[PDB]
A paper describes a structure:
It is an example of a T = 1 capsid and is one of the smallest known viruses with a diameter of only 17 nm. Its CP subunit has a Swiss-roll topology similar to that seen for the first two virus structures determined (tomato bushy stunt virus and southern bean mosaic virus)4,18–20 and now known to be present in the CPs of Picornaviridae.
We were also able to use SELEX to isolate a preferred RNA binding motif for the CP. The biggest difference between the B3 VLP structure and previously determined ones is that here the N-terminus is more ordered, permitting the formation of an additional turn at the N-terminus of the helix (residues 8–11 RKSA). As the RNA density in the B3 complex is not well defined, we have not attempted to model its interactions with the capsid. Some of the RNA binding sites must therefore be unoccupied.
Residue numbers in the entry:
A (entry chain A), B (entry chain A), C (entry chain A), D (entry chain A), E (entry chain A), F (entry chain A), ...: 8 to 195
C-alpha cells in the first residue's frame, strides 16, 4: 500500500508537465581506432521551443539511441558505448576517461568506474562483414534521469552532471557509422 | 476514499504551477451569412511573459468567452459556436468542417462530429431586434483542457490539437458583433 | 461536531457587536467608454456616529449594490464591476488596473488578477434599448470581509486593503447611470 | 496520518521542479540616517537562464541575506530590516511606509503593519565600535513564499506582491555597509 | 420527534380558529419621486364581520400584495416596498423613516433598520417602458405575524406594532400604479 | 452540557469588552399628581469618554436606580415606575402611554402593555408620613439589555428602542423626590 | 479537551477585534544617577484614530520596548526597568517607589513589591565602554494585559491601573540613551 | 473530591495561626453633606500585642462594622459605605474617588469602580425621623482578605492595598452618627 | 499522585505567610588580593518591620545577588563567591575557611567542603579590561533555605547556621566593586 | 526494530576496521581578497603507514578543521568555507566555482550548487579588530563520507569525488590566517 498511491501521484504529476522532445542525427562518420566521444543531450539549449529548455535542468523521461555501421574496404568492428557522465564540469569526456586503453577491445577505466564518474547505459559491438552482413544497426530505448547544464548554448562548456554521450571506437579507420538520438524530457 | 486524497494531490500540484493568463478582444465585426472561424487560443505564443508559453503545450484551467451582437438596418440573428478542434494539424477550420451547410440554422457536420474532430463547448444564438432589444450579449466560463501547438508564433500553422476557436454565422451581412476571451492556463 | 459549536460562538460574538450601517447614493452619471472607478467603502470615516468607524478597520457583514442605466440618444451598454481591492495603498484604482483594455468588452487585466490584487464581487452588463427596455437595474447583496483604511477622512489616500469599489464602463458617452450602496459592518 | 503522506507528495512534487537560483551582491554603501530601501528579488527578470523566470510568478524555497557594517570616523549603528511587501503594486517602498519615523530607533508604521502590507522577516541591529569590534556581520537563512511580478525587467515597476526588500538605516552618514542575497526558487 | 407532534398541535389549534379575511384595492395613483406610504392592515377595524376584528390583536396567517405600474408620457420606474412596522405607536411612517433619502434609488435608513423598527417583506422595482413593456405587475404571497392595534377605527392613530404598509416611490410624477392586498388572519 | 460551555464563551467575550459606566443624579423635584417621565439612559451621548458611546447601540450589563421621597406639608405618596420603552421612535413617553389614567393609583395602560410597547422593570410606592417616617428610599439593581439610539446628543429625539425611563407620580404637589441612576454597559 | 476549544474561542474573538497600534520614540536623553521614570502607555489618548482609544480601557496584546545607551566622556552603566504599575491612581511613579534606594545598583523597594503595586516586566543593564563597545541596545517583546486610564489626555493624571512605564538609572550624568516602544492592543 | 481535602488543609492551617483581634469605636460625629472617609484597618500598627501586627501584611478572617445615626433638629439621612481600597498607596481616599458627586444620593465614581480601585463591601442608608424612629443602627459581619500596609504607625501614609474604610455622607450637618469596628485576622 | 496534592498544600501554606523582604547595597569597595567576606543575611534583625524578623529563624523563599566590577589603573579580575554557611556559630567566615589559599585562582578548602560546612551558591569571575569592557556585572536569583540566627542585632555574633555571605577576591587592590542583595523570606 | 540491530552491525563492522588518521597544519598565510582554495584530504597518499591509504578510496569517519585569523595593519575579515567536491576529476577547484563572485561577501555560485557539484560543510566568517579582538579562531568537527582519489600522490590530479577543501577569502591582503585539519578514516 502507500507505495502504490505514491506512483499514482507520480503519474498525476506527469500529466501536468510538458513532455518536451529533442531529436538529433549524426550520419556518415568514419570508424575510429583511437575513438571519439559524441554529445547527445548537449544539443538541448536554453530557449522556448519544444526541443529547448528553461534553466539548467531537465529530466529525461526516456531516451532512445540508434547506431549503425557499414564495413568499407575491410570487414571490421564498430563499438558504441552509450553513457551518462555523472560529474561533468563542462567538457566532452576523452576516450581514456571511459576506456582503460584506447582500443576497441578495452575494458572500462578502473579509476573512473570505481568513483562512478560515469554510468554505462549500453555497450554495443557490431561486427560488419564484407563477406556476410556488411551493414548492422541497433536501437536501444531506456528511461532517463536528471540532466544538469553548465551554460545556455550547445558547446562543451555547457555539459554538466548527467550529460549523455556516446563513445564510438572500432578496429578500422575506413568503415562508416551513423547514429541518431531522441530524448523525451520534462522541464518544470 | 483514495479518490478524495487524489484531488487533494491535484490541488497541491496546482499551488506549485504558475497560472498564466491570456486575454484577447475582437470588436466591430460584420455579421456573416457564410460564417467565419475566429482564433482564440492561437494568440498564446512562445516567450517568457505571463500571457505566453514555453514549448508546445499549455493546459487551460478555465477560459471565458464573451459575445455580443447589435442589429443594424434589419433585425437579425447572430450565432456563435465556441469549439475545441481536437485534431488540428495547423489550420483555422472552415465553416463547412463544423456545420453541415453554411447557414446559420445548420446542424453540425455529421462526419466530423462522428469522429470527434471537434467538441462543441457552447452554441449561442442571439436574436437582435430593431423593434425590441437590438443589443444582446452572453458570457460563458468553462474549465479547459490540454492545448497542443504546431509552432511558435500566432499564425494558423501554429494551431494544434486542442486549439480553441469560435465560429460566427448569422442571417445578415450588416449587423455588428464583438467578442473577447480569456484563458487561465498552467505551463509546466 | 465542534465546527457547529464554533459557529454558535460566532453568532454569540455577533450579538455583542454593534452592526453599524453606511448608505450612499450616486445619481445621474454619464456612461463612460474609457471607464470610471467609484468609491463605495471610502465614505465610512473616523467618528462616533452609526455610519462612521473607530480606528482603521471595520468588518463588513454584508453589503448591497444597486446599479441602473437609462439609454439616451442611442441604445447602449452599461457595465458595472463591483470589486474589492485587496492591496490598496491609498488610491482609487484606474480602469487599466482592472480591465486588460479600456473597453466595455475587455476581459480582466491578467497581471493584477493573477496576483489577486483584486477580487471581482459581481460583473453586471445592462443593455438598454431605445426600441425596447430603455431602463434596466440590478441589486446584488453579498457577505463582506475586513476592510483596512490608510487614513481618517473620505479621500483616496484613506483607501486601504479590502476597499470596495465599482468600475463603470459602457459603449456611449450619453446614457445615464445611477448607483447606491449600503454596508452593514462591525467595528469592535 | 494523511497529513504525513501529503508532505511526501510535496517532496515528490519538488524533485520534479527545477530549483533556480539567483545571487546578488551590493557592496560599499554609506550608512543612512534617513534610511534606504534596497531591492532583493527584483533582480530575477524574465528569461531562460538559471537565475531568471518564466511569467510573473516564482516561489522562493529558501533565501539567505548577509549584512555587514564597518564603523568609519565614529562608532555607529547599522540597522537592517529584511521584509516582504505583500501588496506591492510596482514600487520600491519608502522608509516611512515601513518605520513610524525615519529614525534608526523607530518602531514599525502602525497603519501598514496593522493591514499586513508588509511582513518583517528579520530586523537586525549592528553596533560597530571604533574602540571595540568595528566590523560586524550577520547571515540569515529562511524559507520563502510566492513572489508575484508586475513586469519583465529589473525596474521598480516590476515589483509585485511578495517582493523581497531590505531597509537599511543607522545613526551616521559615514560608515559603510555591504549586503548580498541568494534566493532558491521554483518556477513551474 | 416532539417538534413534529408540536406542529400537529399547531395544525389542530388552527382548525379551531376562524380564518378571517380582509381584501383591499387601491387603483390609479400617480408615481411619486418623493414617495408615499400606503396602509394595508389598518383597514381591519373592530366589529363582527368576516373582515373585521375583536380587540386589538389579530394574527396574519398569510397575506398577499399585488403591485402594478404603467408608464405615461415617459418610460419610468416604480418601486414598491412592502414592510412591517414592528414598533408603530399610531402613525403612517414617513418615507424618510424607511429610506435613507427620498429617492427611488435610496438604500434603507441605517438607524431605523439597525434597531429593527421595520422589517422589509419584499422590495420590488418595475421599469415600465413606453418603447417596450409599458405595463408591469408583481404578486407576492407571504406568511404573516401578529399585528397589534392602537384603536378601533381605520385611522393612522389605530396602527400599532406589526402594522403592514407599502411604500411607493419612482422617478416620475406621471405614471400610474395600482395595488391590492388580502390578509388571511385568525382573531381568537 | 454545551449550554454550560456556551456561558463560559459569554464570560470570555465579556473580559474582552470595556464595561463603560454612566452615572446621573436628579435631586429636589416636586411630587406630581399628573406625573412626569424622567430620562435615564438618554444621557449616554456619542463620544469617546468612559460614560459615552460609539454608534447608536450599547448593551446594559446591569443598571441601578435609587429613589427617595420626603413628605412636605402633608403626609403623601410617591410612586416610581422604572421601565424600558421597547419601541421608542425618539420621544419621552407621556404619563398616559404608561398608566391607564394620570393618577398615582392607576393600573397600566391596557393597549400599550398588551403590545409590549413597554416593559416595567420595577414599580415602587413610598408612603412618607409627617407623623411617622417622613423620608423613604429604595435602591434597585437589575441586569440590562440592548439600548438603541435615534441620534447623537442628549435630547428626546435621540431616545430609541430599549430606552430606559422613570415615571414619577404621587398624590401631592408639595413633597420632594430625588433619584440617581447608574448603567454599566458594553459598547463593542 | 474543553480548554483547547476555549482558546479556539479566544482566537475567534480576536479576529473580530481591531488590533490598534501605538508607537512612540524618545531619543537623546542623558543618563541619570538619581533616575527617571518615562511614560509608555500614557500616550494612547481618547479619540478615533488607530493609535487612540475609546473609553478608559484597552487591552495590550503585545508590546515591545527598545533601549539603547552610548557612553560619553566616561565608560558607564545604563539600567532600564520596564514595569507595569498595577495600582496607579493618576501619577508617574517616583524612582523610590520602584527601587529601595536611588542608585543604579539598588534592589527593588520591599514594601511596594510585597503588595504587588508593580510588576517588573524586564530589568536590563547595559555597560557601555569607551575602550570597548560604547554603544549597546536591547529589544524586548512581551504579551500584555489590561490597561485602565483615569482621564482622556496624555498627562500623568490619566495614568491608571496597568499603566506601563520605564525607569532609567545609571552611574553617570553624561552618557546618552534612546528608547522606543510600540503597543498592539484591542479596544472593544 | 480533592477540593474537600483542600479545605480540610485550610482548616488545619488556621488552627496553627493566632487569630489576632483589633477593635475600634468612633462616637458622636456630625452628619456630613460633603462626606467624610474614616479609617478602619489603619489602626492595626506594628508591635507585639494581640491587636497589632508583624510586618506589612495581615489577613482579615472576618470583620464587623456597626453604624448608628440619630436625627437632631431635622429628620435626616445617614449613608455609610464600607469599602476596601484595593490599590491604596498611602492615603485616606477622598469622597470624590468613591462617589460620582459629593452628594448622599450619588452613584459610584465610574472611573474608579471600572478599574476596581475599590470594592464596596456594604452600602447602608438609614433615614432617621424626628416624627418616627429617630435612632437607627445596622451591624454587618463579613469575611475578609489580605491587607497590605505602607508603614508602621497609624497614619494615612501607612494605608496600603486592601485597606478598609468607611465613607459617611448624609443630607444634614446636624445629626449624630456612631460607628465601631472589629477585625479578626491572622498574621503569620 | 499524592506528591502533586502535597505541593498544592505547600502553595496554600505560603498564601498564608507574609513574604517579608530585606534589601541591602554595598558600593565602591576596592578589589582585594587577600579577599574579604561580606554579610548578606546578617542585616535581617529582630523587630516588627517588613525587613526584620521574629525569633531566630526565617526561611528564605528566594534571594538575589548583583555583583559589579570596574577596572582602575590596570585591567584586573574580580571573583565573587556567594555561599551559605551551614554551620555558623556566630562569626563572619575567613577567606581561608572557604578557599584553599588566599588567591583569586584558588580551588575550595578541601576539609570544609568535605564536611559540608559551606554550600557554594554561585561562583562568578569577572575580567574587567581597560582596553576592552572595563565594567562588568552579573545578577543571580536563587531559591533559598532556612536561616538560623545566634542573636538579635546585626553583628557577627548573630550569624548562625544557614547564614548567607559573599566572598570577594581578585588580583589587584585598585579596582572597585559594588554589590546589592535582596532576600524574600517567610517568618512564621 | 531491525533498523536498531542494523546499527549494531555497523558498530561491529567498525571495531574490525583500522581507524587511520591523517593530520595537517598550514600556518601564516596572508588574507586574500580574490580567495584561495586549500587541499585537506589530498595529503592522504598511497602507502602503508597510519596516515596513508590502500587503493583510491577511504571513508572519513570524522574530520576536524581549525581556522584562525589575526588582523595586521587594518581590522579585517577572514572567511573560511569548508566544502566537499562531490565531482572532482583531478583538480583544485577555483574560487569562482564555489562563489558567485570573487568577493568575501559573495553568495554561492548558483550553477554549481544547483547540480550539487559541492556540499558546503561549514562557512565561517571571523572579523578581527585591531581595536578589539584581533585574533579569532574556530574549530569544527563533523562526520565524514567516502573520498575517491584519481592518483597515488599528493598532487591536484589525485583529487577525486568527495575530496575535501577549504576556501579562504577576506577583505585585506595583509592579515594572517592559520588552519589545521585531521581526518579519521577507515580504509578496508
Ligand atoms: Ca529546466
Ligand atoms: Ca508548455
Ligand atoms: Ca475599527
Ligand atoms: Ca419595442
Ligand atoms: Ca513562473
Ligand atoms: Ca578596545
Ligand atoms: Ca383579536
Ligand atoms: Ca455602540
Ligand atoms: Ca476601550
Ligand atoms: Ca504580618
Ligand atoms: Ca522567625
Ligand atoms: Ca582504500
Amino acid at each position: 500500500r502507500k507505495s502504490a498511491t505514491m506512483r499514482a501521484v507520480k503519474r498525476m504529476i506527469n500529466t501536468h508537465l510538458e513532455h518536451k522532445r529533442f531529436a538529433l542525427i549524426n550520419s556518415g562518420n568514419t570508424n575510429a581506432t583511437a575513438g571519439t566521444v559524441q554529445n547527445l543531450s548537449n544539443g538541448i539549449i536554453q530557449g522556448d521551443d519544444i526541443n529547448q529548455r528553461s534553466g539548467d535542468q531537465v529530466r529525461i523521461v526516456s531516451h532512445k539511441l540508434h547506431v549503425r555501421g557499414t564495413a568499407i574496404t575491410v570487414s571490421q568492428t564498430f563499438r558504441f558505448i552509450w553513457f551518462r557522465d555523472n560529474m561533468n564540469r563542462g567538457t566532452t569526456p576523452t576516450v581514456l576517461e571511459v576506456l582503460n586503453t584506447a582500443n576497441f577491445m578495452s575494458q572500462y577505466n578502473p579509476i573512473t568506474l570505481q568513483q562512478k564518474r560515469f554510468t554505462i547505459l549500453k555497450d554495443v559491438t557490431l561486427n560488419c562483414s564484407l563477406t556476410g552482413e556488411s551493414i548492422k544497426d541497433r536501437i536501444i530505448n531506456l528511461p532517463g534521469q536528471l540532466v544538469n547544464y553548465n551554460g545556455a548554448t550547445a558547446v562543451a562548456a555547457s555539459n554538466g552532471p548527467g550529460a549523455i554521450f556516446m563513445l564510438q571506437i572500432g578496429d578500422s579507420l575506413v568503415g562508416l557509422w551513423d547514429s541518431s538520438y531522441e530524448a523525451v524530457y520534462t522541464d518544470a
